[PDB]
Design a protein around this ligand. Sequence first.
Ligand SMILES: O=c1ccn([C@H]2C[C@H](O)[C@@H](COP(=O)(O)NP(=O)(O)OP(=O)(O)O)O2)c(=O)[nH]1
Ligand SMILES: [Mn+2]
Ligand SMILES: [Mn+2]
Ligand code: NA
Length: 327
Amino acid sequence: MPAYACQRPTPLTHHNTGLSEALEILAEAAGFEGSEGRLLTFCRAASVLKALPSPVTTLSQLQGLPHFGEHSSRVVQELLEHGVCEEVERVRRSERYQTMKLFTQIFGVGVKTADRWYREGLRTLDDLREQPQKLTQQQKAGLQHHQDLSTPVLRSDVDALQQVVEEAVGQALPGATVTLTGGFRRGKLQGHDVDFLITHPKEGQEAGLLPRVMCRLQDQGLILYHQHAFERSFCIFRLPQPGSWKAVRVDLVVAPVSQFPFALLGWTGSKLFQRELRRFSRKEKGLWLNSHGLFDPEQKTFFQAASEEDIFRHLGLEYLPPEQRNA
DNA sequence: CGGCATACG
DNA sequence: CGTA
DNA sequence: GCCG
Ligand SMILES: O=c1ccn([C@H]2C[C@H](O)[C@@H](COP(=O)(O)NP(=O)(O)OP(=O)(O)O)O2)c(=O)[nH]1
Ligand SMILES: [Mn+2]
Ligand SMILES: [Mn+2]
Ligand code: NA
């Protein structure tokens, strides 16, 4: 088992679901308390279990697995022996965890805002609604639309949504393309949102594209919320439903075709996979990776990539298709 | 012990 | 600060 | 919380 998640395939479904879910609760709790290091270790341990070829049945099977020390091993031990980890259950039922989860789930609220609200004594969505002058416009949208945004987006919704985005994109710039990224590209059947990456085959033609796309979607009556030169938009869209509609979160990102492989790689995720890939790049290869490119800080040069395959090769990693990036 | 990804709105 |  |  290699130590970085980008060095091993991680499928969407696996053989240690219960164990990984428990470790991810502890990760989430760590994040709520501002401990990014502990969040990372718990996420990485969870991901290791996702990458295993069969279920862990005995504690000895954790011996020599990366990211399993005393704490993570004890969590697994208790789950294997009793079907439940007391620490995890204590977290699940803490007022602190439940409220931080509720608040951070709101579009426009992060850990820092949630924590302040918690310290101020606020606990429920109706608590926030009763003092709305204190909310940003983004948070007001997030709170108004919270119920719809809490409903999973279905893979069967994505097709009709991509069609409307393509129509707007084609008027904004003929020849521009729309590629489905995010979790759906990794094979997820549901999502919290839909992520689309937009480019044009002629380098430079994509400049100024996103405002044009957004103004057109807005004129079609499809945009319940967006922030508005820019290249990423975090929207709430009106999606048709039987006799009605629902609000869904849609992310649009534009990249030049030169950068498209890097943007596709970054936006396809998973989040942990990309963190691990960027960590690997810098720490093991001395190269700086982001969603725009891959920089050699010695040569002061950028790697031209024509594909995701190119990027994996340049980093000395075996290629993983999107379905095996579910770290 | 230091480090923990790296951007844009 | 929020967001991916 | 863990690797390195
Ligand atoms: O902090 C982040 C968040 C997202 N990303 C990348 C990876 C992620 O898979 C992708 C899309 O982000 P989403 O928040 O939409 N998550 P995803 O599509 O993987 O799952 P879902 O939308 O179902 O929660 O953007 C990062 O690199 N860093
Ligand atoms: Mn997504
Ligand atoms: Mn998204
Ligand atoms: Na949030």
